[model samples]
Target: TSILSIVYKKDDLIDLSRYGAKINIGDRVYYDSIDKNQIKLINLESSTIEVILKNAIVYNSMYENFSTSFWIKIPKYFSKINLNNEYTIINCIENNSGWKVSLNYGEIIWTLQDNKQNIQRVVFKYSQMVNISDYINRWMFVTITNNRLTKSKIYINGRLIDQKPISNLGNIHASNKIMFKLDGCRDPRRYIMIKYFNLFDKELNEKEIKDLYDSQSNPGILKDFWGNYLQYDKPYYMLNLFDPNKYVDVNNIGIRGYMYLKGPRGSVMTTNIYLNSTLYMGTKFIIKKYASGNEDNIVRNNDRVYINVVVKNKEYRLATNASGVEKILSALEIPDVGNLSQVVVMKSKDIRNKCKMNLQDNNGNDIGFVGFHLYDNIAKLVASNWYNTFGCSWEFIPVDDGWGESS
Candidate 1:
């Protein structure tokens, strides 16, 4: 929880006091003899062409459990044309004692040292290497955390890719020089654009790294608004509709009941889904399709809507309870669906934990069953469904906090 952070954002840099002040193209970086920090400007065309650390904001203690996060784009020619086929993106150390991040042709390597001055390294590369640009061209957000307990964990795009044993990294001396594109800066053509280069005094969790990746949703944001870049007026649900099993079926009207608005059944052409078939009960499940006077449909207010849910178990009951149905729909903010009778509340199977409510007319018309599923966040699914999907009817799917996560 202790935070000593330095962020070099796209629009601007974060507080320089926490990290190095700026980049110096040429000449040896000089730190203050007394306090060990200074700013300098080195010309790129000069005889000296070394990328150097402008100042020393990070001292000895910070190297123990520090984290590095940045967004990097390796271009088609991001690799050097030379035989080595590697470029050092960041190097901050002295006498082989601190740390460095190197971008190799087929892999990314992180180098550090233990107390004994033994060089330690962690390397990562894709299992299958076809074309480097296939994976490298697009911008990728990388967050690396090296700590005592977990050792090291590398996360790419909000997902943890790998973890390794944390080495006993010796203290990073205060005056160790920090450089970017260090060994490979001479060839300007061999480059990778980096942004939001951050160094944290402590290891960050998965949620924190995810927030950084999610910040791309708002590109116009300034550096000062980082750590938290996006704000919402009211919390709304989002759907990754590419998965057929993701949508919620609040009312168990069956899959064929709704014509996908633009395409045939079982096919999704676009985002819109409409009620093709009808039932007696108003189709009240979490759905994007609307009730286009289709007698009984999933939508409300005689209009079209997609992003709303408001999910429920199995028991069988005779035509007796009106109050429970009233209470249930009341919680869901739905009015009574005209004449109701013979309300059967239960699931088809005894073993399933499905909460189903079937509404029938006096003459026995299937108004449709309010098949809901609700369970506490211990995870798994209630009778309702998940975006990750096992299956459900008339379910309300949670798109954001959905799928494989558990408390």
Candidate 2:
């Protein structure tokens, strides 16, 4: 849940007002007069701030995971060789020594160090012989995540570009005091425009990182499956069981299906089903109904149907003809114990041309939905009860809510 601890964002600049002040290269300006290493702010204005530090530092010692996402616009010829020959994004120090995430010329560099030794290191350069000079005057998403040497990943625009092995490292020893633009060594400075800067205490996975990027671009609040406010401090998971791009068979049970489209707001015209290398039900699940009034004719032009199903070592399908109703078309009396891997509603396809299918628990209370047309014909399937039974839950957060400050 460290997601709630957002340190910065572009839309919320008022929060930084408390840290504001007129800055001079050598003048000491303090956020708190009584705090240590009273540092100076070189410049401050709406949506941006600059600091000039020489031996002055700030510290915080409470976090191990580190992450930051921002759009940076660096000016060309901003001094390539300085005291550190680098521009600091975050320089964290512990015991007067620690790690740093910085940019040297055009290369992003991460280094781990102790009181007297360099522990581990990784570098990412857009090209082998290119410099940061070629990447100026534009906005780019820069993200960094470090798990105290166990794992460190760097992303640009939601794509993982580099990862380093950090299994031998332990907890990050940097003092909690995080410094920007200037490292622990001395005056290393650069001018850059940041559209957004967010830091989190938890290491975001690929999906979360991508979502964060998407949120900034779309500027919306992300809500959970229950239509409740999603808190970044709570854990969440994604259910990709029905996602066509993702592997669907969880236990090698060999059950697979696909959707066919007609047009916009279109009905699913065909679905191919397979079970154990055999076509259990060919393309029988189509939009047209059987005129003979057979059991398969349970679906009507606007009627809803349910496919209450239990899947274990084999696939079993049941049918329901009415909404909020339960009916079993067949029962083999399969033993309930040691065989019921899951109980789910595979009948979401029964509702035609609908963008979403409401789902519920056995008690018929609201749970979530099966989002249709995720990619023209695919649906984003989510079964809360099934997830709970499998030791997980669906979590959602509104994308409109501010990360921390009032919006």
Q: Which candidate leads the pack in TM-score?
A: 1
Error of 1 at 373 (Å): 30
Give the residue spans of candidate 2 off by over 4 A: 2-64, 78-84, 114-118, 127-134, 182-190, 218-407
Q: Compared to the true structure, candidate 2 yields what TM-score?
A: 0.38
Q: In lDDT terms, which candidate is top?
A: 1
lDDT of 2: 0.38
Off by over 4 Å in 1: 1-57, 61-63, 77-84, 127-134, 172-176, 185-188, 216-407
Instruction: Give the per-residue lDDT digits (tens) of candidate 2, residues 275-329.
Output: 1111121111112221243343222222232332223433333221122322212
Query: Which lDDT tens digits does candidate 1 get at residues 1-407?
Result: 32323333342334344334554344433222211211221213332212334444444652357788766655332223422456666776676457788876546677766445666677767421221112333346778888855477778777887777754455555334556543654444444445555667678888888876666423332111111211111121222122223332333222212111111113212112111111111112233322244343212211222222222322111122232122122112223222324333223222222223344445645444432233242111121112122233222222211011121
Estimate every model's Cα lDDT from 0 to 1. Answer: 0.40, 0.38
Q: If scored against the real structure, what TM-score would every candidate get?
A: 0.43, 0.38
The deviation in Å at residue 369 for candidate 2 is 35
Single out the weakest 10-residue window by summed lDDT for candidate 1.
222-231
